[PDB]
Amino acid sequence: SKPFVYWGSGSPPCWKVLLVLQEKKIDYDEKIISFSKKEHKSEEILELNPRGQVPTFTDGDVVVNESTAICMYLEEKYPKVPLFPSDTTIRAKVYQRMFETSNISTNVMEFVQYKMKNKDSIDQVLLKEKKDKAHVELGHWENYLKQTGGFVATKEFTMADVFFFPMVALIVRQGANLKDSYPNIFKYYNMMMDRPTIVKTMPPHWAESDSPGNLLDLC
Amino acid sequence: SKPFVYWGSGSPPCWKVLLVLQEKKIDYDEKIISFSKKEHKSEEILELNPRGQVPTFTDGDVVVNESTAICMYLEEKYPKVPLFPSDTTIRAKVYQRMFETSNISTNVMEFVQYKMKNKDSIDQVLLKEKKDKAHVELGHWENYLKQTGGFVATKEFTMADVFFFPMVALIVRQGANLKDSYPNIFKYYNMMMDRPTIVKTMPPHWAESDSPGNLLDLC
Numbered sequence A, B: 001s002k003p004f005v006y007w008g009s010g011s012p013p014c015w016k017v018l019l020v021l022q023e024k025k026i027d028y029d030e031k032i033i034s035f036s037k038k039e040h041k042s043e044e045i046l047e048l049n050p051r052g053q054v055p056t057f058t059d060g061d062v063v064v065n066e067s068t069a070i071c072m073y074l075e076e077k078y079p080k081v082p083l084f085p086s087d088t089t090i091r092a093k094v095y096q097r098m099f100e101t102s103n104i105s106t107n108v109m110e111f112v113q114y115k116m117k118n119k120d121s122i123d124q125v126l127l128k129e130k131k132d133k134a135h136v137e138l139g140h141w142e143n144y145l146k147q148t149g150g151f152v153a154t155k156e157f158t159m160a161d162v163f164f165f166p167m168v169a170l171i172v173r174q175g176a177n178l179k180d181s182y183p184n185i186f187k188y189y190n191m192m193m194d195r196p197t198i199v200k201t202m203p204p205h206w207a208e209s210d211s212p213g214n215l216l217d218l219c
Ligand SMILES: N[C@@H](CCC(=O)N[C@@H](CS)C(=O)NCC(=O)O)C(=O)O
Pocket: A008, A010, A011, A012, A013, A014, A040, A051, A052, A053, A054, A055, A065, A066, A067, A068
């Protein structure tokens, strides 16, 4: 049995899956679909995933789509390279950080959404509201990296970094100068960006396209 | 070591934790906080949870807050009553359903949010948009229950039902007549509502308060 994963460029849910696969060094087959050409809605994809989304994934008769379910399945199916420590108490912290990352999406990426959605309708009395929420959110993670001095959950790479980093990258892709404002996250970013597995899974379309820059003002 | 959980009434994240605790029959200590009196922001809560949210949870030196992390920790710490089957392939389906339930929140509960948020500003040209999304979302789950004939993920109660049911209940609490429109979800609801563990964890404030009814029109 050899895993197969349909995924697109610039998608954190897909990145999570690719990182897990690479980090555990599992040989897999893939189909890099085009979002702009709506390939995530192909019939081939819909048979496996009624929601027409990526990642979509198989491994024999095993079919799983939620990026988080795929990662959990991979951790359980291919145990040789653990992305979780063995200590139950410490694993709890890894799980905490993993799932807590859904907050970045809401409190951070909302800042970008707003400027794009209701554009031309810029209300700085509200703009400064969500901007402060983004910073409040990032502060938590900043403190976390500060607290460990290394990776988002512990002093080693774990499933939590698989969830967190893609979000950090997307933030920087939007142009966040975190160098001085969030020295720990930035230190974490540059550190991670240097990890082989991450260099290998950078979103394909990023190199030859310009940053959306919806965050150039962040900090 | 005895678990301690701070939680509030009518909160799906808290319900998930209570169900897991009850279903595995773990004896725990609790603090039922008042949201209206802002007790989720107490100092006692903030020391353990910098976000000032519930559930907030401890078990010795073990501190975990994300409802999903707590459930995973409980599954791993107290294995006697498994909420997951042993088959790795089948567990994958349980994980799929568990995490996919985050969609109900977005595609379903948005319908309720909108009518509350931008109220008085009712735009039925858009109202009928999200209403159709709610039905599309529920259809997936309807088909799932149809596909199994029993619980949301398999023919037994699993961690997936722990995630799904609270959302179904909240929907009905908003007044959804799913009897004829979603016979399988409704059958699932009445079935679940009858399970001892669920009767015991119904949101405390529901009995003596009226349904918000933001869904009475759903179907
Ligand atoms: N909860 C899913 C979400 C996946 C998702 O949102 N995928 C996007 C790309 S990042 C997609 O394919 N979207 C297409 C759509 O909604 O049609 C996960 O984490 O896997």
